[PDB]
Amino acid sequence: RPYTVLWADDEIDLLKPHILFLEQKGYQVTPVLSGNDAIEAVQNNDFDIVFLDENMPGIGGLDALQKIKELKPYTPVVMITKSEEEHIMTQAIGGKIADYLIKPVNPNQLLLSLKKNLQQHSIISETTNTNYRQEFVQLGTQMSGKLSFEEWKELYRRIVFWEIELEQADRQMGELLEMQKQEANRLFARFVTQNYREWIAKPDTRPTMSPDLFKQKVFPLLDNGEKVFFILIDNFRQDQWESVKSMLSEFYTFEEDMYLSILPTATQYARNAIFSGLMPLQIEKMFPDLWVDEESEEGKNLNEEPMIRTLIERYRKHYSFSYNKVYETKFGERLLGQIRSLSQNQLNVIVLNFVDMMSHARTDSKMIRELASNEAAYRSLTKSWFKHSTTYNLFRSIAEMGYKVVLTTDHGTIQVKNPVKVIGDRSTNTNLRYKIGKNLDYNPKEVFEIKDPASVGLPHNNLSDKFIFTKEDDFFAYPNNYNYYVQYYRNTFQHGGISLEEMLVPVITMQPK
């Protein structure tokens, strides 16, 4: 079918050449001479696009625009006018013009506007598909052999880019990308299992990990005289950063990086290591009062403010600081109210827990299983949360306050698929990606077993002597109710183990505009 163009201009005879050109390109043009005729035509037809003059006897083009946009908000309107007046331009933009062309007009400029306003999505979709096919082999090479840490960061960033871009592209491309990501996770699990014990043993040569994060990314700003908000969104994957960065770009410029969470990729271990600057085992040894056992009923992350204080002292720094923890926008609304009273501190730490709650809810909440059924829906829901919770205005307020922001997380999460059998663990019956126990029964081939937890900076109970971790998108399952257990947890989001999504996480340094 040919696209239809309604063209209102009182001097349409002067546009004959351009109409002929459009008709030769395959467009059907209906010309009218006034804004009232244009309104009537839009009322009784479904034109694909409207071209409007501004200065016409009768109602002006800007008045016609308003009425047309009321009738057919979804139809593009292009203003084609001789006026060079800035206030006309501004009122056209404000009336939701799709484009604005000052006369005289090159007919090819009209063709550009038609392609862009009527076929942008299918043109971008085809170009994406072409570009992915032309890079598919390069990506497979990019993840081959042995990669440096910096190469893993680039690779994972490129895979996430394609995951998002291929939402808007041919499905078969999705299947190809899924399989490439599957391979990347298999290779990354290898990379981690081969080096992990040595990363903990040799702190000087290891990539930035949870206990290094404040020293590497926060202290240098503070020591250079900058005021910093450290915003920890629990359970925030790289692809969620990518989904919210466009919104934040209105208020901040970015320095984007990633770092490695320790194992287990879980709050009790990684987030306390962030805020203490220590491996969990060093927290227990140096500050036994701050470390809560895994078997305890006491909350595991209630000593982060004392931990931060010890970390600041340990490095002989004297920074003033605050610490606030948020679970609901409502207490988040309180914090937003009192946010400017934090302007006295060099360092203001905010923990947002809602995304972690939402993520766990993908297991037991029917609403969340529908709203985050897959990873594209998860990202979309993350964007809606960010925008319509107090988070958006928190970031906007902080920017007005002139603070730099360090936006990061303690770990990500991964959608799990295939079960791994296990038995006999203690106090880890809740977690599906790592277990702690003594006489654990499992297949050593299917996990990463730590038989010496003290070698990788982990404490434990006397009743437990080992950790085991799942890799890739496996999840632990018990035999006694295996088949219900497998059906219930398949395709849920889980953290604690080894994967790109869980361990390779964003840390963004942001400067207000």
Residue 371 beta carbon to its own copies: minimum distance, rounded to whole angstroms: 6
In sequence order, what are the residues at sequence separation of 6 or more whose Cβ sits closer than 8 angstroms to the Cβ of residue 290? Answer: 276, 283, 303, 306, 307, 310
Q: Is 95 in the site for Mg ion (CB under 5 A)?
A: no
Distance CA 466, CA 453 (A): 6
Q: Is 106 in the site for its own copies (CB under 8 A)?
A: yes
Q: Is 325 in the site for ligand BEF (CB under 6 A)?
A: no
DSSP letters along 254-283, please? EEEEEEE--SS-SHHHHHHHHHHTS-HHHH
Distance CA 418, CA 427 (A): 23
Task: Please list every residue from 84 through 103 that binds ligand BEF, using CB under 6 A.
Answer: 103
- Rg over CA atoms, the chain: 28
Residue 203 beta carbon to its own copies: minimum distance, rounded to whole angstroms: 31
Distance CA 382, CA 243 (A): 8
Q: Is 358 in the site for its own copies (CB under 8 A)?
A: yes
Q: Which is nearer to Zn ion, 31 or 280 (CB)?
A: 280
Distance CA 244, CA 379 (A): 9
Distance CA 43, CA 382 (A): 39
Asked whether 231 and 407 are in contact (CB, 8 A), the reply is yes
Q: Is 363 in the site for ligand BEF (CB under 6 A)?
A: no
Q: Is 384 in the site for its own copies (CB under 8 A)?
A: yes
Q: Is 484 in the site for its own copies (CB under 8 A)?
A: no
Q: Which helix (H) or strand (E) holds 116?
A: helix 107-142
Distance CA 327, CA 313 (A): 28
Residue 465 beta carbon to Cl ion: minimum distance, rounded to whole angstroms: 10
Which spans in 32-82 are helix H? Answer: 35-44, 61-71
Binding mask 105-134 for Zn ion (x = CB under 5 A): ------------------------------
**What secondary structure, in 3-state letters, does 143-197 show?**
CCCCCCHHHHHHHHHHHHHHHHHHHHCCHHHHHHHHHHHHHHHHHHHHHHHHHHH
Q: Which is nearer to Cl ion, 387 or 451 (CB)?
A: 451
Q: Is 172 in the site for its own copies (CB under 8 A)?
A: no
Q: Which is nearer to Cl ion, 16 or 451 (CB)?
A: 451
User: Which of the choices its own copies, Zn ion, ligand BEF, none does residue 53 contact, using the CB cut-off of 5 to 8 A by kind?
Assistant: ligand BEF
Residue 355 beta carbon to ligand BEF: minimum distance, rounded to whole angstroms: 9
∠ at Cα 350 (379, 390), nearest 5°?
Answer: 55
Q: How many CB atoms lie within 10 A of CB 426?
A: 17
Rounded to 5 degrees, φ, ψ at 251 are: -120, -15
Contact segment (CB under 5 A) with Mg ion among 3-11, 173-181, 310-318, 328-336 equals 3-11
Binding ligand BEF by CB under 6 A: which of 185, 210, 267, 272?
Answer: 267
Residue 341 beta carbon to its own copies: minimum distance, rounded to whole angstroms: 21
Q: Is 53 in the site for Mg ion (CB under 5 A)?
A: yes
∠ at Cα 383 (219, 363), nearest 5°?
Answer: 95
Q: Which is nearer to Zn ion, 15 or 266 (CB)?
A: 266
Q: Is 121 annotated as a binding residue?
A: no
In sequence order, what are the residues at sequence separation of 6 or more whose Cβ sits closer than 8 angstroms to the Cβ of residue 135? Answer: none
Q: Is 449 in the site for Mg ion (CB under 5 A)?
A: no
Q: Which is nearer to Zn ion, 243 or 267 (CB)?
A: 267
Q: How far is CA 462 from the centre of its chain?
A: 40
Using CA atoms, how far residue 64 sits from 36, 52, 67, 128, 315, in Å, is 7, 8, 5, 37, 67
Binding mask 413-452 for Cl ion (x = CB under 5 A): -------------------------------------xxx
User: Which of the choices its own copies, Cl ion, Zn ion, none does residue 452 contact, using the CB cut-off of 5 to 8 A by kind?
Assistant: Cl ion
Query: Tokens 């203001």 map to which residue?
Result: 348
Binding ligand BEF by CB under 6 A: which of 4, 30, 55, 66?
Answer: 55
Contact segment (CB under 6 A) with ligand BEF among 81-89, 115-123, 144-152, 205-213 equals 81-89
Which candidate, 27, 29, 32, 30, places its Cα nearest to that of 9? 32
Task: Please list every residue from 22 through 61 that binds its own copies, using CB under 8 A.
Answer: 46
Task: Please list every residue from 289 through 348 that binds its own copies, using CB under 8 A.
Answer: 328-330
Q: Is 167 annotated as a binding residue?
A: yes
User: Mapping DSSP to helix (H, G, I), strand (E, B) and coil, where does residue 95 land?
Assistant: coil
Binding mask 74-93 for its own copies (x = CB under 8 A): xx--------x-x--xxx-x
Residue 428 beta carbon to Cl ion: minimum distance, rounded to whole angstroms: 17
Q: By the criterion CB under 5 A, which residues form the site for Cl ion?
A: 450-452
Q: By the criterion CB under 6 A, which residues form the site for ligand BEF?
A: 53-55, 81-83, 103, 234-235, 266-267, 356
Q: What residues form the annotated binding site for Zn(2+)?
A: 234, 267, 318, 356, 360, 410-411, 495
Q: By the criterion CB under 5 A, which residues form the site for Zn ion?
A: 234, 267, 356, 410
Q: By the criterion CB under 5 A, which residues form the site for Mg ion?
A: 10, 53, 55-56, 60, 466
